Amino acid sequence: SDKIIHLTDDSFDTDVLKADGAILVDFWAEWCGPCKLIASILDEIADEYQGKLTVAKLNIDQNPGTAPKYGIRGIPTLLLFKNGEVAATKVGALSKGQLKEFLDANLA
């Protein structure tokens, strides 16, 4: 977890919106089962894509203000921001392979 950014409603506008590059935001909560699966593979993802991707997590129970700004309906939901704009969206549980496919198709 040394490369995973911990976001809050208070730092989202700065850490995400004012950043140029690609940032993957993982919206999760402790009660969400599928979220735990995705969480166990992020450290590997952050290492493999470092230099071209930053991985961040935001707990919606502790920080309830951000998700509604993007109309998120449920979790897990992964949003890929590029220079402060949503460039890709993925909802539901996914295997390591599917996540890697989602990233390769959307990054550069």
Q: How far apart are CA 7 and CA 3, in angstroms?
A: 13
Q: How far is the CB of 91 from Cu ion (least distance, A)?
A: 25
The pair of three-digit structure tokens given for residue 25, joined into one six-digit string? 């935001």
Closer residue to Cu ion (CB): 1 or 50: 1
Neighbours of 103 (CB within 10 A): 20
Q: Is 1 in the site for Cu ion (CB under 5 A)?
A: yes
6 bridge partner residues:
57
Closer residue to Cu ion (CB): 1 or 83: 1
Binders of Cu ion among residues 13 to 72 (CB under 5 A) are none
Q: Is 2 in the site for Cu ion (CB under 5 A)?
A: yes
Q: What is the dihedral of CA 83, 98, 94, 79, to 10 degrees?
A: 10
Neighbours of 81 (CB within 10 A): 20
Active-site residue, 23 included = no
Q: Is 83 in the site for Cu ion (CB under 5 A)?
A: no
- 25, 35, 80, 99: which is the annotated catalytic residue? 35
Q: Is 8 in the site for Cu ion (CB under 5 A)?
A: no
Active-site residue, 32 included = yes
| Active-site residue set | 32, 35
